[PDB]
């Protein structure tokens, strides 16, 4: 059912420290070199007021270069899909909890996405915009009871150096019966390339290779 | 002060849930190659009640193949050397905290070592050495407070597949003044190659590099 160059569609519905808000975006990506970018905009709780990169990783596994060697978990539950549940446990007490239904509607992946967080810090690195970009991770996915985790290291750099720690909790579950995969690694790089001024419109890329 | 071919003398004291033991050992190493081998008998404690494997991560990046365009903190740190200290945080709530002091007697590393674990289950995998290996991991080292934080995502091969998940929180003091790098990682292999039939005497390999 993969084909090279697929199409994104998503919303996503949430709120952070109480301050309610919706996204919508559309994309592109090559499932088979583990790229993909997006256009994403603000469709309602603009602006927001808190570092938008909290937001980004929620923003498909299935967009990474899987190996020959290595059980691709995600693109054999097509066309029927998969869902996945995170936990974003950010050191400052901060925390966001997050889940995307992932659909197939012929040749565009469909996002279900919710999200939310709080206790945030008021003076902290989200709540006053200074986080700058996630420095690039390794996830570890490995089986557990019949579907696939994944956690991460993951780090915020932050305005003035310094870096701003989270660490992330995956679960993903294939809605139907797929082969399940050894412990590997997944590559990640994620950046926002573009955007406006308050980050309504905001173009997001991320490339992903796995290995072992 | 680094040469190509160094050697490696050490003594570990530790104790694991109420079990005390020492644990000496030799080797050698290439730093600018990020490899290196020991062999570890057990001097007291003999046999040990618990899976080795908790141990082995404990027995120095200086022995990671670091690029020129990566700032090495270990290898700068020497004549004088380092130390660091490691949280060891497995998911069945066993704790293990150990530090080491890093000195060069001149073209030997010498490694001091205090270990401490407890809280284990007795029916856990550490308590009944079901414990294969070390899965392969990527540490983020990222700078904090003018030291150097090593956080990473590790996770134990079990018998019958499975995988027991351990958070892994280093941090390292150079003892004199050096330069400090910007976020990176390290690639590292850890391998029991050979041991007799209870672990007294333990053949020791890690493979290691770092990049960006």
Same mark, same amino acid.
């Given at each position: 059912?993969?084909?090279?160059?697929?199409?994104? #569609?998503?919303?996503?519905?949430?709120?952070?420290?109480?301050?309610?808000?919706?996204?919508?975006?559309?994309?592109?990506?090559? /499932?088979?070199?583990? @790229?993909?970018?997006?256009?994403? #905009?603000?469709?309602? +709780?603009?602006?927001?007021?808190?570092? $938008? !990169?909290?937001?980004?990783?929620?923003?498909?596994?299935?967009?990474?270069?899987?190996?020959?060697?290595?059980?691709?978990?995600? #693109?054999?539950?097509?066309?029927? +899909?998969?869902? *996945?549940?995170?936990? =974003?446990?950010?050191?400052?007490?901060?925390?966001?909890?997050?889940?995307?239904?992932?659909?197939?509607?012929?040749?565009?992946?469909?996002?279900?996405?919710?999200?939310?967080?709080?206790?945030? /810090?008021?003076?902290?690195?989200?709540?006053?915009?200074?986080?700058? #970009? *996630?420095? /690039?991770?390794?996830?570890?996915?490995?089986?557990? !009871?019949?579907?696939?985790?994944?956690?991460?290291? =993951?780090?915020?750099?932050?305005?003035? +150096? +310094?870096? $701003?720690?989270? !660490?992330? @909790?995956?679960?993903?579950?294939?809605?139907?019966?797929?082969?399940?995969?050894?412990?590997?690694?997944? !590559?990640?790089?994620?950046?926002? @390339?573009?955007?406006?001024?308050?980050?309504?419109?905001?173009?997001?890329?991320?490339?992903?290779?796995?290995?072992?």
């Amino acid at each position: 059912v993969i084909k090279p160059d697929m199409k994104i #569609k998503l919303r996503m519905e949430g709120a952070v420290n109480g301050h309610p808000f919706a996204i919508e975006g559309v994309g592109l990506g090559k /499932p088979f070199e583990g @790229k993909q970018s997006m256009d994403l #905009k603000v469709k309602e +709780g603009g602006p927001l007021p808190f570092a $938008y !990169d909290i937001l980004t990783t929620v923003f498909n596994r299935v967009f990474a270069k899987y190996p020959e060697n290595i059980v691709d978990y995600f #693109k054999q539950s097509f066309p029927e +899909g998969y869902s *996945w549940e995170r936990s =974003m446990n950010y050191e400052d007490g901060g925390i966001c909890n997050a889940t995307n239904d992932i659909t197939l509607d012929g040749d565009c992946y469909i996002y279900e996405i919710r999200f939310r967080g709080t206790n945030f /810090p008021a003076n902290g690195p989200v709540m006053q915009k200074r986080t700058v #970009k *996630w420095e /690039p991770s390794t996830e570890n996915l490995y089986v557990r !009871d019949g579907v696939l985790k994944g956690d991460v290291v =993951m780090a915020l750099s932050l305005e003035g +150096g +310094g870096h $701003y720690r989270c !660490d992330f @909790k995956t679960t993903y579950k294939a809605k139907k019966v797929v082969q399940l995969p050894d412990y590997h690694f997944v !590559d990640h790089h994620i950046e926002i @390339k573009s955007h406006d001024k308050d980050y309504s419109n905001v173009n997001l890329h991320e490339h992903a290779e796995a290995h072992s």
